[PDB]
Design a binder for this molecule. Structure first.
Ligand SMILES: [Mg+2]
Ligand SMILES: [Mg+2]
Ligand SMILES: [Mg+2]
Ligand SMILES: [Mg+2]
Ligand SMILES: [Mg+2]
Ligand SMILES: [Mg+2]
Ligand SMILES: [Mg+2]
Ligand SMILES: [Mg+2]
Ligand SMILES: [Mg+2]
Ligand SMILES: [Mg+2]
Ligand SMILES: [Mg+2]
Ligand SMILES: [Mg+2]
Ligand SMILES: [Mg+2]
Ligand SMILES: [Mg+2]
Ligand SMILES: [Mg+2]
Ligand SMILES: [Mg+2]
Ligand SMILES: [Mg+2]
Ligand SMILES: [Mg+2]
Ligand SMILES: [Mg+2]
Ligand SMILES: [Mg+2]
Ligand SMILES: [Mg+2]
Ligand SMILES: [Mg+2]
Ligand SMILES: [Mg+2]
Ligand SMILES: [Mg+2]
Lengths: 120, 205, 109, 116, 40, 37, 64
RNA sequence: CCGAGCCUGGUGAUAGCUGGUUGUCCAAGAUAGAAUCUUAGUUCAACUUUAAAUUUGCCCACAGAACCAAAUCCCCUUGUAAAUUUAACUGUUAGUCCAAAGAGGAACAGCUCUUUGGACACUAGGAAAAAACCUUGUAGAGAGAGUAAAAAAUUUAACACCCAUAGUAGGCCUAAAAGCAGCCACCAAUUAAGAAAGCGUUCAAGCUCAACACAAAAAUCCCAAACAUAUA
RNA sequence: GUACCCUAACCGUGCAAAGGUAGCAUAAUCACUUGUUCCUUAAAUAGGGACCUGUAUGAAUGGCUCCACGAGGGUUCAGCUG
RNA sequence: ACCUCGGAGCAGAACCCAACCUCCGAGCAGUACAUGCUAAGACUUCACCAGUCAAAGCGAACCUCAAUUGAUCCAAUAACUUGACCAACGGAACAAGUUACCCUAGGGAUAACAGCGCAAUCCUAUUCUAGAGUCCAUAUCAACAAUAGGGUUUACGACCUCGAUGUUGGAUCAGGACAUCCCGAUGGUGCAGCCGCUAUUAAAGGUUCGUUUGUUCAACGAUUAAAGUCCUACGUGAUCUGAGUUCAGACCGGAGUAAUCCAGGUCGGUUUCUAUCUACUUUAUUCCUCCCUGUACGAAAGGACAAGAGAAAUAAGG
RNA sequence: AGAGUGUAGCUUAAAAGCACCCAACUUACACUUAGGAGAUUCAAUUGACGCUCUGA
RNA sequence: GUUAAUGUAGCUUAAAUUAUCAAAGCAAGGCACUGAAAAUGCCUAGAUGAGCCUCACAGCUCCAUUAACACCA
């Protein structure tokens, strides 16, 4: 029959080759994902149509900050074929309440906290 | 007795209860009788199938025909036909029970040895009549040695290590990468894309 | 020729799993043969059902099967075992939550 | 449960064997079934020596299938008892036989006759 | 094709172009990166 | 149709694509070894 | 799916292929003494225990 | 117009059966089952709708669920916003294909029957056309933009040249079977040629070889046109 | 059981009220059956005449001949006529 | 054949899960006579009805078995209780046959015809050398099997059609396929010649008349260069026919108590349309005779090709 | 002569627990119930009585 | 093809467990001999695969066979 899929823990154990291809650190990892749905929930089972509603990814190509914790990551492991996961990197820090209204999330995955529309 | 003994159409006491067609004794790699025991040359099964009594008479007559019993011997590796296959009587409508037992059948999976040969003889004297028996079998078959069986197995081990394709079938199926387990079987995780039904793709990694 | 066999399912099996809070008299697991044997504060009906005797939390454990000596079938299975052999069965217990009552001050006489 | 490490903790039929010629295969040579006929005209001397060979076998882990008797013949009735033995090693064969020789009480005759 | 081209015993064959191979491959590389960032 | 048929059963197209993506690619050397002494 | 056992399983070291040559409990009291001793040994699974838990003196006595 | 006239009346007979059921706009909305002179139907459940009350619902982690495979159940966190109860009822209970596990049949069916999950009866783009495969769902205007799925690849069979004496028709068995009807032995000459590996003789003889030497076929008419070479 | 140019009454304990007789017969008569043979035709699953395993023929459910008769159903000679 | 209940498999691990699916069973028996009364909490055969389990308490003492069954109706009994193979087992009431004299409402939810799916059956082609063919696998045929293809058959399925897609053969006029029966061109032969047999190639042309039968088939008569296999809604009934096959009447044999039926035979039995639209309405083969010559070939008996000439026949055009 | 050493039969028992013996029910074994015999090799962790082995 | 019954000594009838008897053949006896009549024996895997009990003995299991049924165009 067609059931849900238990993906083994070996698949989510990154190799030291993988830390060189994608620019991640094993020690001190990132805190917040940027989840973006890139596939439809149609022609997918109902246990994936509801997980996508649980993460807020009902719209395609709309990013969403989620924590990098093993309970949010258990939901992202169900629908990893539907989404695209990238780390939210913060070149400057998290925005204060003065820099809250001048932020922008870039396509590199970084959240700049001062966003003028002037060239360098 | 250096000849293939007589294989009977049915057991001595016959099966009285009609068994369902477990077709899963054809699909997948074989586990019983995959290696050589007191022999040198054999007939490998490169695909699954059912041996009727007619195939056993083909193998028994046309191995004992072309043979030196003073220099060669042969043993069976497949059993006598035991699984009952029930045909309904001809020209009947559908339903009304299950048909009566007509004949018996051995299941043979892929990678199974069928007959074995031996004696003071090399392979070229044996590739003659073992490659003509292998062509009459209902599955794709092959005459193998002990040296050419372990060559074709160590070759596929070298195919599985050399390939520049970053994606294999096991990496994609066991991880459920594109959600691809919606179109695969649960058997395809241990089949790894090399077995499709009764058939066997040996060029596939 | 094959008539009969249209029996429905019994709907037996575990009604209250591991760690569930269970009051007294709750049927824990209905069975057909002895799959789970009773343990602490768990009784057996006539039809081998397992009901709970106290208010508590259901625990499933594995312990040593020592049958009754008047149960001549199992004793004759015990005395065929080799010398180091120990049988085990899955037991169902109820860990009783509340105490059976407190001492309350009624009146100063 | 099957998926748990405690699977098969309660299985027991592999500890119970629920269900002959001379076995000399390559080195481990052992007899088949034996019979030990003991005939004497005393029921006291035949019944009591039937116990001791059975007590000698039990103390040496030799398998005793039957310990029955064949009926008497009116000569004065000669009482005959059969003690069925299976399995002796090479070192055990001379030693297990010579003690039953070296304990025959009073004029009882031995036998290592066999089945049928 | 005997009846209903895409269903049944005898279907018309569909084949995999370079479009369909490259479309699955670039979806397989988003997936391999997904397994990386969920591993830490 | 059963899972084991006498003919080669037609694959689902998304199954047919990963049997085309995951095909064996042989290691091609830079210089052909018959062009080297 | 199967998960391997964590510690040693019971009836595993005494497990042989010969069951006629191995000596048995012939009785109920020989089994129960081994049964009571095994229930007191600590095990790696869940049990009931987890939730519901000179020389002159001998010479004088041997003379006496 | 006679298997029982015709007319009026009961009579607006009855029909689980067919047909029909008329302004506008929005919203929610699809498939467990059981009984039944019942399977063309209905009642109850399930699902659905509204209103109301409350507090948990879904996703889930360790631990846990029996002896003779994929998974599920249970389940705090966590992600989330729903669920249960109460009140009031209608309608759907004549499904299809695909993937998977099986059963029946021929390991036939666009076949039949269960289960798990999709899609369809709902829009759009693609697979030529196309209910069911793939992409994609929440609505409007635009003579903006980035994308998703998305175009079938293959073309295959040459081959040696030279040379051949001899113990002996090896014995046996056989009319005789000589290298070759059969069995046993299978040594031995010259540098090198088997007491013969294919043909050939009633049996012989002759020829060689081993040995030196140097995939496709059916019925109105094939079916885009075409194109190996300008930089992913 | 036995007939012996395949032809001896030459024996037949089972029972039923009685056990199909005369005649006719491949019939308008289940199938077998275009039954076996002759005449008819160059050629006959048609038509006519004889033989009976007609094991579902048959005596007012009437049996069998024959004279007449028929917009009845088949077959045929000769003539004739698009 | 079946209809209710239960155990096991399908349904491998919570529950559930169909089948005119596969296998076993049940409609009781035995022992008690506290097999007394009560009552928390639960299970539940996917509803309901029924079914289960049960602590405490009272009272005493110091049930087994998987199924082993049956609602309501108020009466039979003083009461307690008891009563169905209501087995079609959620149960009307104990009510049957038959319809071709049939009728109505419907259904392509559902059959016959046709299409379609499918290819078991059928036909074909290659692979394999067993064996036949004196010897000799492959001139020719071919066992066990194998891999393909076709869509003639017998079937299966039930997808279009029951507010009608009308049928067997025949007539008429045919269109097409080639897997070629004849004519053409070649290779092999166990091909001397003559006859053949087999394969490659070729669909331009051709493919008869009769007796019996409704017959397609089949047998037979006489021929032919040959009297091809098929497909086209088993081609074509708004072109025709109606013998068979489906009616209303009727005998005969049989089945039935009869009404009536057989798929058994036989005699008889209404075949409707004024054309709206599409489409369309003047695109040379063969045989025999003679000659070559009774030559080649053959030991003879026999007996040709090619070339040449003439007679015909059909077809097309006049 | 040297080495290993040494609790009743066995003990990573510390005077223990199993093994063990007889009697009765058992054809007998088994079970059970009644009974039965048992040891730290002696001297201050140490030394010398006994056993096992390697030697002559 | 489905429902239905059937299975016998050398062959058939029967017996409601146990197995009876007329033919068949085996001799002897009367007759010159041969058929009959006697007087005697025999010939039954009760068609069977297992045995719940014990089974022609009676249900599955069955292999032959006997009748009806051999629809529906
Ligand atoms: Mg069941
Ligand atoms: Mg059911
Ligand atoms: Mg089509
Ligand atoms: Mg009305
Ligand atoms: Mg809406
Ligand atoms: Mg109805
Ligand atoms: Mg929860
Ligand atoms: Mg269908
Ligand atoms: Mg939108
Ligand atoms: Mg050579
Ligand atoms: Mg319920
Ligand atoms: Mg009580
Ligand atoms: Mg009813
Ligand atoms: Mg009912
Ligand atoms: Mg009539
Ligand atoms: Mg049809
Ligand atoms: Mg239909
Ligand atoms: Mg259907
Ligand atoms: Mg119709
Ligand atoms: Mg119409
Ligand atoms: Mg051709
Ligand atoms: Mg027609
Ligand atoms: Mg017409
Ligand atoms: Mg008339």
């Amino acid at each position: 029959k067609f059931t849900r899929s238990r993906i083994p823990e070996k698949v989510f154990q990154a190799s030291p080759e993988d830390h060189e291809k994608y620019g991640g650190d094993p020690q001190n990892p990132h805190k917040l994902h940027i989840v973006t749905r890139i596939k439809s929930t149609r022609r997918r089972p109902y246990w994936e149509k509801d997980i996508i509603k649980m993460l807020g990814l009902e719209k395609a190509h709309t990013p969403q900050v989620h924590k990098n914790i093993p309970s949010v990551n258990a939901k992202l492991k169900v629908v990893k074929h539907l989404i695209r996961i990238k780390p939210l990197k913060l070149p400057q820090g998290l925005p204060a309440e003065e820099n809250m209204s001048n932020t922008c999330l870039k396509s590199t995955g970084e959240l700049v906290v001062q966003w003028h529309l002037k060239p360098v | 007795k250096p000849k293939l003994r007589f294989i009977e159409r049915a057991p001595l006491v016959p099966k009285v209860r009609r068994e369902p067609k477990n077709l899963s004794d054809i699909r997948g790699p074989s586990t019983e009788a995959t290696e050589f025991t007191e022999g040198n040359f054999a007939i490998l099964a490169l695909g699954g199938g059912y041996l009727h009594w007619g195939h056993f008479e083909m193998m028994r007559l046309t191995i004992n025909r072309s043979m030196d019993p003073k220099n060669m011997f042969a043993i069976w590796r497949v059993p006598a036909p035991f699984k009952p296959i029930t045909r309904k009587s001809v020209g009947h409508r559908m339903g009304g029970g299950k048909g009566a037992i007509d004949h018996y059948v051995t299941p043979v999976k892929a990678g199974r040895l069928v007959v074995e040969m031996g004696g003071r003889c090399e392979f070229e004297e044996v590739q003659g009549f073992l490659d003509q028996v292998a062509h009459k079998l209902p599955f794709a078959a092959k005459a193998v040695s002990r040296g050419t069986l372990e060559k074709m197995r160590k070759d596929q081990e070298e195919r599985e290590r050399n390939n520049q394709n970053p994606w294999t079938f096991e990496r994609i199926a066991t991880a459920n990468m594109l959600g691809i387990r919606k179109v695969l079987s649960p058997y395809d995780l241990t089949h790894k894309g090399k077995y499709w039904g009764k058939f066997y793709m040996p060029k596939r990694v | 020729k094959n008539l009969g066999g249209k029996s429905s399912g019994r709907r037996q099996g575990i009604k209250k799993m591991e760690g569930h809070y269970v009051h007294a008299g709750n049927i824990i697991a209905t069975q057909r043969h002895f799959r789970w044997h009773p343990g602490a504060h768990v009784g057996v009906g006539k039809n081998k059902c397992l009901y709970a005797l106290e208010e508590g939390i259901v625990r499933y454990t594995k312990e040593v099967y020592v049958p009754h000596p008047r149960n001549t079938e199992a004793v004759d299975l015990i005395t065929r075992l080799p010398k180091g052999a120990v049988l085990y069965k899955t037991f169902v217990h109820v860990v009783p939550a509340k105490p059976e009552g407190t001492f309350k001050l009624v009146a100063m006489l | 449960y099957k998926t748990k490490p405690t699977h098969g903790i309660g299985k027991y039929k592999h500890l119970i064997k629920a269900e002959v010629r001379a076995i000399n295969l390559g080195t481990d040579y052992e007899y088949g079934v034996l019979n030990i006929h003991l005939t004497a005209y005393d029921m006291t001397l035949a019944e009591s020596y039937a116990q001791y060979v059975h007590n000698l076998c039990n103390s040496l882990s030799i398998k005793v299938e039957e310990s029955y008797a064949m009926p008497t013949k009116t000569i004065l009735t000669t009482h005959e008892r059969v003690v069925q033995i299976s399995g002796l090693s090479a070192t055990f064969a001379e030693i297990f036989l010579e003690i039953i020789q070296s304990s025959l009480p009073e004029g009882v005759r031995l036998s290592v006759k066999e089945h049928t | 094709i005997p009846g209903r081209q895409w269903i049944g015993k005898h279907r018309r064959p569909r084949f995999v172009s370079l479009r369909a191979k490259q479309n699955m491959i670039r979806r397989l590389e988003i997936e391999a990166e997904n397994h990386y960032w969920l591993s830490m | 149709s059963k899972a084991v048929t006498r003919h080669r059963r037609v694959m689902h197209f998304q199954r047919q694509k990963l049997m085309a993506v995951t095909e064996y690619i042989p290691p091609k050397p830079a210089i052909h070894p018959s062009c080297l002494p | 799916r199967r998960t391997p056992p964590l510690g040693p399983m019971p009836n595993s070291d005494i497990d042989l292929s010969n069951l006629e040559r191995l000596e048995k409990y012939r009785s109920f009291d020989r089994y129960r003494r081994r049964a009571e001793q095994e229930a007191q040994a600590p095990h790696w699974w869940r049990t009931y225990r987890e939730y519901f838990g000179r020389t002159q003196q001998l010479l004088e006595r041997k003379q006496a």
